[PDB]
Amino acid sequence: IVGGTASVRGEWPWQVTLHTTSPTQRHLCGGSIIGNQWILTAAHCFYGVESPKILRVYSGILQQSEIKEDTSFFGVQEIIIHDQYKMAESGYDIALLKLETTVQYTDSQRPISLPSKGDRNVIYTDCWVTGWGYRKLRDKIQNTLQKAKIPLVTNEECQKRYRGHKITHKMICAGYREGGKDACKGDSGGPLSCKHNEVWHLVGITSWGEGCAQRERPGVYTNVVEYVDWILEKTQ
């Protein structure tokens, strides 16, 4: 996260870190707890992941250095990728992870609600993006979970900044005109969380963008509301 600050223990309990063991163990992507054995993330994270066996979902983690060899994780039983996904910029950058076991909800690990279908005429103004991603375009992956407050920009407005691509209604954009605050590489698949009437909602999944925190270049997120039917169908 570019231009953010450090999160506190249990500030974003739905945030998970998604590890790969091949070739060696490292943070791959972000994800959100939405059900007892369901992580909502971005499809582009799994390019070149061939077996769900090389994945490790760690929850209740604030700092990466908390993860030791004996720290427990949730195994991925199934990776579900939207049939229509081809690449981030084309859309359908959405994926589910069905965990081998259910999460035991505590204060440091617990779920975020999806938006409602009637919540499509709702305008979120209290939105936050979170991850262990890069602090700048040419950086590394952070030890402490970073947070940054960011305002949504309208699909129409976003489209003007990105004439190199099509910005569909199944996407949502968020950024500052002058930039400075944005998600970055490694934040992918993590949450953009917006608070509506004291209830936190999963409004977007971190998908892509032109560089990181560039001015006039808003972050692009998978519009979660446009997928509730897809998600519910899959989460059974």
The catalytic residue positions are 44, 93, 188
Contact 5, 148 (CB under 8 A): yes
Please tell me whether 56 is known to bind a ligand.
no
Which residues are CB-neighbours of 76 under 8 A, at least 6 positions away? 52, 53, 55, 56, 57, 97, 98, 99, 100
Please tell me whether 26 is known to bind a ligand.
no
C-alpha 26/C-alpha 4 separation (Å) is: 22
Write the burial class of residue 167 (CB in 10 Å: 0-12 exposed, 13-18 middle, 19+ buried): buried
Query: What is the Cα gyration radius of the chain?
Result: 16
Report residue 233 as tokens: 């169908």
The single-letter code of the amino acid at 141 is I
The helix (run of H) or strand (run of E) holding residue 143 is: none
Residue among 38, 31, 26, 29 at smallest CA distance from 12: 31
Can you say which residues are annotated as belonging to the binding site? 160-163
Can you say which residues are annotated as belonging to the binding site for heparin? 160-163
